[PDB]
Amino acid sequence: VRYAATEIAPTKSARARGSYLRVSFKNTRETAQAINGWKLQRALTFLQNVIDKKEAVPMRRYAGSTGRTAQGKQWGVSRARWPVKSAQFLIGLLKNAEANADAKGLDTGNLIIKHIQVNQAPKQRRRTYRAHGRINPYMSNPCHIELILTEAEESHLSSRQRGVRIRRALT
Amino acid sequence: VAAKKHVPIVKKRTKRFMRHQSDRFKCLDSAWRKPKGIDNRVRRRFKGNLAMPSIGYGSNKKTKHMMPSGHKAFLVHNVKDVELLLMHNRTYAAEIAHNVSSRKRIDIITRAKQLGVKVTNAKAKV
Amino acid sequence: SSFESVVVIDGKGHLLGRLASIVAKQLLSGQKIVVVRCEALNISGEFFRAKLKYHAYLRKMTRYNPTRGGPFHFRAPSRIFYKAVRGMIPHKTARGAAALERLKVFEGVPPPYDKKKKMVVPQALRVLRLQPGRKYCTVGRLSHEVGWKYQDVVARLEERRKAKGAAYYERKKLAARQLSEAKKAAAAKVDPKVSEALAAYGY
Amino acid sequence: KRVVLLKCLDQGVLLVTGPFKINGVPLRRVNARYVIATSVKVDLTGVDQAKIDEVAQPKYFTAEKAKEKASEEKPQKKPVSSTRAADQKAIDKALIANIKKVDMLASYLASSFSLRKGDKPHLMKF
Amino acid sequence: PSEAGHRLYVKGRHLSYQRGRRNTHPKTSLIKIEGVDDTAAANFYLGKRVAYVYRAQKEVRGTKIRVIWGKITRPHGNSGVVRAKFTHPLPARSFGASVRIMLYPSSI
RNA sequence: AAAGGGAAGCGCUUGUGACCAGACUUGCGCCCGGCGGAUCAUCCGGUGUUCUCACCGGUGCACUCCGCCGGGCUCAGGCCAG
RNA sequence: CCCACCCAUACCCCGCCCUCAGGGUAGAAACGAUGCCCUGAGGAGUAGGCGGCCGUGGAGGUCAGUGACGAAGCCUAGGGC
């Protein structure tokens, strides 16, 4: 399997992956953008607070006609939510990555989430019944999640220009 | 070797002719198409619009099909093909075909260095 | 044609349209222009004609929402001059904005422009353009009648500035006199060959 | 800088000197299109026209150019040859001898030209 | 020490390109030279070299300063505005920028 | 990586930043010196031809030819320019 | 009324491209003669008419054609015509 971040070597980094997970792609993307670039323990604590309704994930792109809250001031926005399902899935993946890092022997407390990417999985094709004998799609939009934790860490001058450099060097 | 003496190679136009609305639709290729509508502004030649190719853009017959080095490309597939440029190392440059294997490429490059004829992309597959 | 770092123009005795055209040409050419004392600026014609023009300008406003898009009526003389300048400049272009940022207009002469040399524009002076007998009005008077509140404050600030300028005037007169007797006393000790050569050359 | 013309060479080239003890300009070549001719004419009774002909002779300034550049490549001042030094002295001895007769001409030729505000070169007389 | 300047050029301002009311030809530029007001005054500066000097971001060959060169071709109008032809047309951001008109090639 | 004060996209022309394709690395011709060889020209016999021209073997023996190595000289060589 | 100035694809000169026209080229040391050399004029275009080339699938001949030391395909702010 190939990750999107092929530049990161696996010698001193940990990775976790999850495919065809029945969790909302938009909410998972917002949660990943919330926890991107963070320390692992801080990210785990923040996701537990998102479950416990204490810290909110700001709604940045997928945020049309959403609610406003006082907890978005920690991000500098007004719209923020609590995707607890995406939070649970991401704690599962982050604990898997922490376990893989302990298996590799890396220092757990010095790991940051260098890479995290959420992509659109193949959709679940349910149907719903409407008025006038019509049937519309009632599809689910799953996502593929991957994440990587890393340890925190005068030529061709002219003759005249040569002359002026020599003269100001002398004087 | 060096190319023979020639007139200065002049290009009347260096920008490619784009199809109208090819920048606005991805179903339209950038290859040139003549607008045939009766009220199309490009066809009616309003100012500020796309120009059309015409015979006034044609380059000089003395510099026709010539690279800026002064050579004309000759596509080559084998040693017997590069031997055909024994007389034209001052005006013709061999261009190796894309599907020629590496050993044959090395043999053609060696023979072309012997003949003194320029190979355009001799740094390939090295 | 002389290039300066910045040109300060006293607004007194100038004509609005001609001065605005001249300074707009200078700004678009690249000359930095500061105009002071816009309260003493002049507009030709009788004063009720300018009152007609400004009240007709007051009639215009966006009907559905006067807080956006409408003609915003700046009552200050300097802002009226700025509107006249801006109407002669492509202000919706980047070049027009970059020219308009080179202009400053004020009421009275605020410091430190009070201690800087002020130019006058002969092509826009009333005494050099208007025929005698023709009426004229004051932009400051028009502004005061249409709602500019700061006529008297500018008046008393200009009064105190004129008092300080008068004090600087007797200092400058004293310096001019003592320079005159300095030159007269030094004239005895000038080498005669130096005197004759300088007189021959023109000083 | 302000120099004195010795003689006019071929193809727009002029041969000038400072003199070297007045402003620091040695025997040098300039171009006639890159100079402004003034109304001051230094009198040349006493200068040696044989050495003027020798310095006006071609290959005088460029015979050892390659050797000097190869020798030059802590910075050090390039050595001026004894021929150039003796020729400069032989030209300029009579030059300062004639210049010091005219008052403050040495200060003029030591002073460098500069433009002030209000100096209009289409109205300035040189 | 010396308290003098070192300017051996004459200043100018770059106005615009050769243009009509709508169409604009950047192949020829319009300049005011400092202190010229007449066609006779501008006739001196015909054929003089002209240099426009600007600054860049990168360091190439020991300089962050680039120069575009040209020459004065012909007078324009009656107010001493001159036409200049360069090796590369001037940037349109340089409307109002200062330019250096040389005293060479001289016919004095 | 970049732009955004009620559209973007497009043509000409510069400029800015990033990234690249060519060309050049010396050749040609003499004058010397040092090498290494006799594929020099004539004559003879045979062979094939365009029926007067070439090849092969005897053929050179060093002021003749063919390559190499050091210099020197002449010429032509990329871009921007005066 | 007078003077000067600004500019269109309009006119003059020059280069280039195409079309058309008018010419030359074998006891051939002689040519993609279906070629080359010289000169002049013109260049918008719907319905419409005509000519030359580019590309796609397959067949005969040929290139003693290319190819697992990589064919076809696809990606490419990388280039040349």
Place this chain on the structure above:
RNA sequence: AACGCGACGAUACUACCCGCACGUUGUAGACGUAUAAGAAUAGGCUCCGGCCUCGUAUCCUAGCAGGCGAUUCCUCCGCCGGCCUCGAAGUGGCCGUCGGUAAUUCGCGUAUUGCAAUUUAGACACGCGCGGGAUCAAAUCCUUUGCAGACGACUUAGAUGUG
């Protein structure tokens, strides 16, 4: 004015201030980027003699991009300290110290950047550095309040107390 402005309080740090040390740091664009009366124009200015189309003027302007040493001069400029002074968007006057200074003359150097190639030279702001001087703070989430409220937002209270 959510891209107008002012005053005040507290300001932890990699924050603040001072010195120099420079920017492959940025600027609608330095090259002497010099120059303050007010007022009238069928009237003004003054030294009180007279003067006024004219700024075509005044200041400054010479030296390795401006050196070194004398002769000579007490002229000009700049940094600091003191006393005053400057509120229209605040800065100048005097004194004192120090440093530089062709107004006159002379002596040694200038070359070689090769016959032009911006003359890389200034200001503001920004950043990385040292060596020092000064200071140990707030806001938000959370709980609570109902003078408020769709949610945000607003009025409150949470650190020893009249909680």
